[PDB]
C-alpha cells in the first residue's frame, strides 16, 4: 500500500526541504534468473537541506526490506518500516546526508521497475515507469515533482544486458559475470522522470548533428531482440531528427539534455512516457504486418509528443499534478505543430480535427461531461479525475489558446517561460503570465471560461446577401455552452468562404477572415461586399472548440458536394459537422450513411484522399448503423454499406492504403453472402484481391470476420494459431474465439474475461475485444444484467487499471433500449466507486443519445 501523498503534505515538505543530489546504486546481478527472482538491491545516498534545523520530515520508499538507514551518521530505527509511511527523518540539520540500503521489488504491473521474461528466447527485460509517484519503488526519494535534484545512477547488471538511463554512461567488466554501468550525473529533474531500461535489447544508433548552437544529440533506439526484425529504425530516426530540427527553432531553446534514447518495451501500460533522455514506447508501435499511413502518422505524433516534453514537462515541470492536463495538452498540440512544420504529415491538423476534436465533442455533448481542470487533493485523484475528455478537450482548448494569443506570440511567450523557469517548476498561471506579456492579451478570465466549464457553443453564420450574391450583413451567432452553465465564450476563429474553381470544379477558399468572436452575436464587417460562394465555414482552419453549423445553402452544398472540397481540413470539418449532426439527432443516420457511401467514384468517402479520414468516417458509419439507425432500417443500411465497401475494395488501387482500409472496414461489418464468399476467397487464395498483402495480421482480421458470421470456427482458429504461434497470434486467436456465434462460446468468453485472473492482461483484453459484434446482438441480450450485477465485484477484485478495460469494453452499448437505461438507472442509485460511476454514467448517456437518434432516423 504506497502512500497517497496529499497536495498539502507535498507543499509542507517542499517548503522545508531542498534536495541537491541523489546517488543511486542498483544491484541487478540476480535479474536474469527465472520467475522466482523478486528483489534487487537499492542503495541511495541523498544530500538535502532543511530550512528549519531540528525539524522532522520523511522520505519515501516502497521496499520489501530496509536493511539500513543512516542520517548524518546516526543509525535510524527501521524495525517498524512500512512502505505506507516511508522513513521518518528526525532532528534534521541545515545540511543533511542520508544513506539507505534496501531491497526493492520488481513488478509486473504499471508501476516501478517492471520485469518481463521473453518466452521466445528467455531474455529478461526491465524498464521503469514512475509517473506519477512510483520512483519510490526503485530508490529512496522525496517523490514529488517540485523537489528536483540531480541523479547519478550506477547499476551492476548481467553481462549480456544493455543498460539505458537518462544520461550517458561508462561500462566496465567486473569479471564476475556482470558489468558495471556508471551513468553521468543528470541535470536537475523530477523523480518521476528518472529512467532505467535494462536487458538484452537490440540497439540501433544515429546522431542529430550540431545545429545553430544546439550540441549534436546522440540517438539510440532499443527493442526486444525477438522484435528486432520488424523495427523500422531508419524511419524512426528520420522523424526523430525532423523533430529535433523543429523544436529548438520553435521554442528558441536548445535541447536541454545530453542524448536521446527511445526504447520499445514489453507489457507497457502507459503507451509512451517522456523520461528525460530515455523515452519508452509500447510495442504495438513496432508493426509486424502491413498497416496504412494513418498508423505511421499516429506513431510519429507520439514520438514528437514525448520529444516536446523534453522542454515542456522535463526542463520546466508542473509544481503539482493539478497541471497534468496542461502538460499533456501542450505536448499534444506541439506534436501536431511539429508534424505539420517538419515531417511528411503535413495534413496532421486534418487528423487532429477528425480524431481528437471529435473525441472531445462526442463526450462533452453528453450530460456525463466534466471540465478539463480538476481539483487534485492527492495522488489518487490523478487517476480518477483525469480521463479521455481531459486529454482530448485539453488539447483542443489549448489549440484555441494558441489562436487567441497568436501563434508567433505564443512561441515567444514559451521562450520566456522556458528561460524564466528552466530547471524549476511552474504553474498554469506562470504560463498565462508569459503569454499575456508576449501578446498584450488579458488572460485573467480564460481559465474560468474554458478550463472550468463544460459543454459546447454552437457557432453559425447569420447572413444576408444582395442580388449579386454579395453579403450585405454577416454575423457569427454563438449559443450558450451546453450541457453546462450557458456562458458565451470568447474565441479567435476564422471564417472561410468557398466557391468553384473554374478550372477544376472543386470548392476552393475564396476569402478568409480571422477575428475575435464574443457573446451572442459578432458582426463581421470585413465580409460586407464579399461574394458568399457556395459554402461558409465559421470555424475554418479549426482554430476553436465549438459545434460548427452551416447556413442552409452551405448545408445543401455539403450534402451534395462534400467530396469536391479541395483541401483536406475544410473537407474534414464538413465530415465532422455531419457526424456531430447525426449524433445529436439533427441529421438522420440513414442520410449520414448515404453521404458517406455516395454513388460514384467521385462522391462520398470513396473519393476521400486522407486515409485517416476514410478510416475514421467508416468507423463512424458503422456506429451510425448499429446505434443510431431505426432498427427496422438497419438490415438495409448494412446491405448498402457492405455492398459499397466491397465495390470500393475492388475498385481501389492494388496494394494501396485505400484498398486495405476498405478491406479492414469489411472485416468489422455485418456481411451478406456475396461479401462472405469474396472474403473467403481472399483469405484462402482461391480468388485473391489483386495487390492485397494477405499477411499474418490481415489473415487474422479476415478469419475473425468469418468466424463472427459462422463461416469458420474452432478448427480454423486452431489451424491459424498453428501458423502464427506467437504472443500476438495468441491474442488474435482469443478475439476469434470470443467471436464464435453460440451461447456457449459467449458464456465462456465472459467467464474468462471477467473471472480468470491467471490470464495475462493482454489476453483478457483480447477476449473482450471479440465479445461484441454488430451481427450478434441477440446473443448478447442476457449480458446486460450480467454486467450490472458483476462490475462492482470486478472493480473491487482487480486494480482499477486492470478493471477499466472490462468495465469499458463490456459496457452493453449494443442494448439500445429503455429497459437497459432502467437497469442502469437503478445501479446508479446504489453506492459505488466514483470512477466506476463515471464510466457507467457515460455508457448510459450513450444509450440515451442513441434512442433519440433512432427516433430521429425514422422521422
Ligand atoms: Ca501511473
Ligand atoms: Zn505527454
Rg (alpha carbons) of the chain, rounded to whole number: 28
- Cα distance between residue 568 and residue 564, in whole Å: 10
For residue 552, give every residue at least 6 positions away whose Cβ sits within 8 Å of its Cβ, in sequence order, or none: none
Pairing of strands 124-129, 112-117: antiparallel
Q: Which long-range contacts (CB under 8 A, 24 or more apart) does 465-471 make?
A: 465/532, 468/531, 469/531, 469/532, 470/529, 470/530, 470/531, 470/532, 471/527, 471/528, 471/529, 471/530, 471/532
For CA atoms 582, 586, 592, 593, give the dihedral sign. Answer: positive
Domain boundaries, the chain: 7-200, 781-859
SS3 126: strand
> Which of 782, 799, 805, 791 has the alpha carbon at shortest distance from 837?
791
- Cα distance between residue 572 and residue 582, in whole Å: 15
For residue 491, give every residue at least 6 positions away whose Cβ sits within 8 Å of its Cβ, in sequence order, or none: 400, 403, 404, 457, 459, 478, 516, 517, 518, 543, 544, 546
* 262 and 240 Cβ atoms separated by less than 8 Å: yes
> Which of 247, 240, 235, 334 has the alpha carbon at shortest distance from 287?
235
Q: Residue 199 class from Cβ within 10 Å (0-12 exposed, 13-18 middle, 19+ buried)?
A: buried
* 679 and 702 Cβ atoms separated by less than 8 Å: yes
Residue 187 is given by DSSP the state: P
* 645 and 666 Cβ atoms separated by less than 8 Å: yes
Alpha helices of 634-695 — where are they, by DSSP H? 634-651, 657-667, 673-684
- Cα distance between residue 404 and residue 379, in whole Å: 33
- Cα distance between residue 550 and residue 540, in whole Å: 12
- Cα distance between residue 90 and residue 210, in whole Å: 49
- Cα distance between residue 720 and residue 580, in whole Å: 40
H helix count then E strand count, the chain: 27, 28
- Cα distance between residue 719 and residue 715, in whole Å: 6
- Cα distance between residue 681 and residue 290, in whole Å: 20
Q: Residue 127 class from Cβ within 10 Å (0-12 exposed, 13-18 middle, 19+ buried)?
A: buried
3-state secondary structure 766-832: HHHCCCCCCCCHHHHCCHHHHHHHHHHHHHHHCCHHHHHHHHHHCCCCCCCCHHHHHHHHHHHHCCC
Which residues, in sequence order, are bridge partners of residue 243?
A: none
* 466 and 532 Cβ atoms separated by less than 8 Å: no
Q: Give residue 277 CA to ligand 2 midpoint distance, Å.
A: 14
* Number of Cβ within a 10 Å radius of residue 710: 14
> Which of 263, 286, 224, 269 has the alpha carbon at shortest distance from 108?
269
Resolution in A: 1.9
* 49 and 94 Cβ atoms separated by less than 8 Å: yes
Q: Which long-range contacts (CB under 8 A, 24 or more apart) does 841-847 make?
A: 841/368, 842/363, 842/366, 842/368, 843/808, 843/811, 843/812, 843/813, 844/368, 845/366, 845/367, 845/368, 846/366, 846/627, 846/813, 847/813, 847/815, 847/816, 847/817, 847/820, 847/821
Q: Give residue 381 CA to ligand 1 midpoint distance, Å.
A: 12
Residue 528 is given by DSSP the state: T
* Number of Cβ within a 10 Å radius of residue 30: 14
> Which of 730, 762, 764, 799 has the alpha carbon at shortest distance from 267?
762
CA-to-CA dists, residue 846 to 591, 628, 852, angstroms: 20, 10, 10
Backbone angles phi, psi at 851, to 5 degrees: -60, -40
Active site residue 306: yes
**Half-sphere exposure at residue 340, Cβ-oriented, CA atoms within 13 angstroms:** 14
CA-to-CA dists, residue 583 to 597, 679, 848, angstroms: 18, 31, 11
CA-to-CA dists, residue 353 to 144, 260, 454, angstroms: 35, 30, 19
SS3 205: strand
CA 541 remoteness from chain centre: 23
> Which of 522, 543, 616, 631 has the alpha carbon at shortest distance from 578?
616
* 450 and 500 Cβ atoms separated by less than 8 Å: no
- Cα distance between residue 351 and residue 610, in whole Å: 9
* 68 and 78 Cβ atoms separated by less than 8 Å: yes
**Burial call 791-815: b when 16+ CB within 10 Å, e when fewer:** beebbeebeeebbbbbbebbbbbbb
Q: In what order do the strands lie in the sheet with 547-548?
A: 521-523, 471-478, 458-465, 547-548
Ligand nearest to the CA of 799: 1
Ligand nearest to the CA of 192: 1
> Which of 598, 611, 484, 471 has the alpha carbon at shortest distance from 547?
484
> Which of 443, 424, 423 has the alpha carbon at shortest distance from 435?
443
For residue 704, give every residue at least 6 positions away whose Cβ sits within 8 Å of its Cβ, in sequence order, or none: 667, 732, 735, 736, 739, 770
| Residue spans of beta strands (DSSP E) within 501-569 | 507-517, 521-523, 535-540, 547-548
- Cα distance between residue 423 and residue 317, in whole Å: 8
* Number of Cβ within a 10 Å radius of residue 627: 22
* 60 and 142 Cβ atoms separated by less than 8 Å: yes
Ligand nearest to the CA of 800: 1
Which residues, in sequence order, are bridge partners of residue 328?
A: none
Q: Give residue 516 CA to ligand 1 midpoint distance, Å.
A: 39
**Burial call 836-859: b when 16+ CB within 10 Å, e when fewer:** beebbbbbbbbbbbbbebbebbee
- Pick out the residues of the known binding site for Zn(2+): 274, 305, 309, 328
The H or E element spanning position 170 is strand 169-173
**Terminal-residue alpha carbon distance, the chain:** 56
Residue 525 is given by DSSP the state: G
CA-to-CA dists, residue 428 to 171, 360, 435, 566, angstroms: 41, 21, 11, 39
* 496 and 509 Cβ atoms separated by less than 8 Å: yes
Q: Give residue 10 CA to ligand 1 midpoint distance, Å.
A: 18
Catalytic residue among 111, 239, 301, 306: 306
* 617 and 576 Cβ atoms separated by less than 8 Å: no
* 108 and 284 Cβ atoms separated by less than 8 Å: no
- Cα distance between residue 492 and residue 539, in whole Å: 9
Pick the CATH number of 7-200 from 2.30.110.10, 2.60.40.1730, 3.30.499.10, 3.30.413.10: 2.60.40.1730
Q: Give residue 509 CA to ligand 1 midpoint distance, Å.
A: 45
Backbone angles phi, psi at 204, to 5 degrees: -125, 150
For residue 293, give every residue at least 6 positions away whose Cβ sits within 8 Å of its Cβ, in sequence order, or none: 611, 612, 657
- Cα distance between residue 259 and residue 10, in whole Å: 31
* 625 and 641 Cβ atoms separated by less than 8 Å: yes
- Cα distance between residue 40 and residue 790, in whole Å: 38
* Number of Cβ within a 10 Å radius of residue 425: 18
* 311 and 251 Cβ atoms separated by less than 8 Å: yes
* 810 and 780 Cβ atoms separated by less than 8 Å: no
* 372 and 391 Cβ atoms separated by less than 8 Å: no
- Pick out the residues of the known binding site for Ca(2+): 131
- Cα distance between residue 207 and residue 240, in whole Å: 10
Amino acid at each position: 500500500a504506497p502512500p497517497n501523498l496529499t497536495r498539502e503534505q507535498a507543499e509542507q515538505r517542499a517548503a522545508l526541504l531542498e534536495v541537491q543530489s541523489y546517488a543511486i546504486e542498483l544491484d541487478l546481478s540476480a535479474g536474469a534468473g527465472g520467475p522466482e527472482v523478486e528483489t534487487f538491491g537499492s542503495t541511495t545516498t541523498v544530500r538535502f537541506r532543511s530550512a528549519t534545523p531540528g525539524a522532522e520530515s520523511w522520505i519515501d520508499l516502497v521496499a520489501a526490506r530496509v536493511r539500513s538507514a543512516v542520517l548524518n551518521g546516526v543509525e535510524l530505527d527501521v524495525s517498524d518500516y512500512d512502505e505506507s509511511t516511508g522513513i521518518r527523518l528526525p532532528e534534521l540539520a541545515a545540511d543533511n546526508e542520508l544513506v539507505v540500503h534496501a531491497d526493492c521489488q520488481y513488478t509486473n504491473t504499471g508501476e516501478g521497475l517492471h520485469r518481463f521474461i521473453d518466452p521466445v528466447d528467455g531474455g529478461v527485460y526491465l524498464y521503469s515507469q514512475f509517473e506519477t509517484a512510483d520512483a519510490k519503488r526503485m530508490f529512496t526519494c522525496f517523490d514529488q515533482p517540485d523537489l528536483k535534484a540531480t541523479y547519478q545512477i550506477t547499476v551492476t547488471a548481467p553481462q549480456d544486458w544493455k543498460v539505458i538511463s537518462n544520461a550517458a554512461g561508462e561500462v566496465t567488466d567486473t569479471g564476475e559475470g556482470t558489468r558495471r554501468h556508471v551513468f553521468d550525473t543528470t541535470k536537475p529533474m523530477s523523480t518521476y522522470l528518472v529512467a532505467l531500461v535494462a536487458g538484452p535489447y537490440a540497439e540501433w544508433r544515429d546522431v542529430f548533428p550540431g545545429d545553430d548552437g544546439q550540441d549534436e544529440i546522440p540517438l539510440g533506439i532499443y527493442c526486444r531482440a525477438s522484435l528486432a526484425e520488424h523495427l523500422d529504425a531508419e524511419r524512426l530516426f528520420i522523424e526523430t531528427k525532423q523533430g529535433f530540427g523543429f523544436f529548438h527553432k520553435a521554442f528558441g531553446v536548445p535541447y536541454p539534455f545530453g542524448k536521446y534514447d527511445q526504447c520499445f518495451v514489453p507489457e507497457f501500460n502507459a503507451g509512451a512516457m517522456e523520461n528525460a533522455g530515455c523515452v519508452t514506447f509500447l510495442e504495438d508501435y513496432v508493426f509486424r504486418s502491413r498497416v496504412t499511413g494513418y498508423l505511421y502518422e499516429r506513431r510519429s505524433e507520439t514520438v514528437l509528443h514525448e520529444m516536446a516534453h523534453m522542454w515542456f514537462g522535463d526542463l520546466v515541470t508542473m509544481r503539482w499534478w493539478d497541471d497534468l492536463w496542461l502538460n499533456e495538452s501542450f505536448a499534444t498540440w506541439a506534436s501536431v505543430l511539429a508534424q505539420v512544420g517538419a515531417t511528411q504529415y503535413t495534413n496532421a491538423w486534418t487528423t487532429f480535427a477528425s480524431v481528437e476534436k471529435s473525441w472531445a465533442y462526442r463526450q462533452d455533448q453528453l450530460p456525463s461531461t466534466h471540465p478539463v481542470a480538476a481539483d487534485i487533493p492527492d495522488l489518487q485523484a490523478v487517476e480518477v479525475n483525469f480521463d479521455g475528455i481531459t486529454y482530448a478537450k485539453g488539447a483542443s482548448v489549448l489549440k484555441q489558446l494558441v489562436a487567441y494569443v497568436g501563434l508567433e506570440n505564443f512561441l515567444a511567450g514559451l521562450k520566456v517561460y522556458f528561460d524564466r523557469h528552466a530547471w524549476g517548476n511552474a504553474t498554469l498561471d506562470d504560463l498565462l503570465v508569459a503569454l499575456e506579456e508576449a501578446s498584450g492579451r488579458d488572460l485573467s478570465w480564460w481559465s474560468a471560461q474554458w478550463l472550468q466549464t463544460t459543454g459546447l457553443n454552437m457557432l453559425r453564420p447569420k447572413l444576408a446577401i444582395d442580388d449579386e450574391g454579395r453579403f450585405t450583413s454577416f454575423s457569427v451567432l454563438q449559443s450558450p455552452a451546453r450541457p453546462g452553465a450557458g456562458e458565451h465564450r470568447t474565441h479567435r476563429l476564422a471564417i472561410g468562404i468557398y466557391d468553384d474553381d473554374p478550372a477544376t470544379g472543386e470548392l476552393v477558399r475564396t476569402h478568409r477572415v480571422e477575428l475575435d468572436v464574443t457573446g451572442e452575436r459578432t458582426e463581421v464587417p470585413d465580409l460586407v461586399g464579399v461574394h458568399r460562394g457556395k459554402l461558409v465555414l465559421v470555424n475554418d482552419d479549426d482554430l476553436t472548440y465549438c459545434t460548427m453549423r452551416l447556413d442552409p445553402q452551405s448545408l445543401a452544398t455539403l450534402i451534395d458536394r462534400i467530396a469536391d472540397i479541395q483541401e483536406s481540413l475544410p473537407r474534414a470539418l464538413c465530415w465532422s459537422t455531419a457526424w456531430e449532426m447525426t449524433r445529436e439527432a439533427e441529421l438522420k443516420a440513414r442520410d449520414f450513411v448515404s453521404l458517406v457511401l455516395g454513388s460514384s467514384p467521385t462522391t462520398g468517402i470513396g473519393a476521400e484522399s486522407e486515409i485517416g479520414v476514410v478510416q475514421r468516417v467508416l468507423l463512424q458509419t458503422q456506429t451510425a448503423l448499429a446505434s443510431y439507425a431505426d432498427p427496422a432500417w438497419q438490415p438495409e443500411g448494412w446491405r448498402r454499406f457492405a455492398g459499397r465497401l466491397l465495390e470500393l475494395a475492388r475498385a481501389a488501387e492494388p496494394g494501396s492504403d485505400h484498398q486495405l482500409a476498405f478491406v479492414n472496414s469489411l472485416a468489422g461489418s455485418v456481411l451478406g453472402e456475396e461479401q462472405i464468399s469474396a472474403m473467403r476467397g481472399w483469405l484462402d487464395g482461391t480468388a485473391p484481391l489483386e495487390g492485397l498483402t494477405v499477411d499474418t495480421d490481415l489473415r487474422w482480421g479476415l478469419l475473425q470476420a468469418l468466424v463472427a458470421h459462422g463461416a469458420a470456427g474452432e478448427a480454423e482458429i486452431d489451424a491459424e494459431l498453428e501458423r502464427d504461434q506467437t504472443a500476438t497470434g495468441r491474442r488474435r486467436a482469443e478475439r476469434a474465439r470470443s467471436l464464435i456465434p453460440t451461447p456457449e462460446a459467449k458464456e465462456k468468453a465472459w467467464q474468462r474475461a471477467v473471472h480468470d485472473d491467471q490470464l495475462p492482461n493482454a489476453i483478457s483484453d483480447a477476449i473482450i475485444s471479440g465479445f461484441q459484434h454488430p451481427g450478434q446482438r441477440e446473443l448478447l441480450a442476457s449480458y446486460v444484467r450480467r454486467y450490472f450485477d458483476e462490475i462492482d465485484e470486478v472493480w473491487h477484485r482487480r486494480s482499477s487499471e486492470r478493471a477499466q478495460p472490462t468495465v469499458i469494453g463490456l459496457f452493453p452499448s449494443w442494448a439500445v433500449d429503455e429497459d437497459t437505461v432502467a437497469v442502469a438507472d437503478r445501479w446508479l442509485e446504489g453506492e459505488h466507486a466514483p470512477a466506476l460511476r463515471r464510466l457507467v454514467s457515460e455508457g448510459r448517456a450513450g444509450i440515451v443519445r442513441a434512442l433519440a437518434a433512432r427516433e430521429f432516423d425514422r422521422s
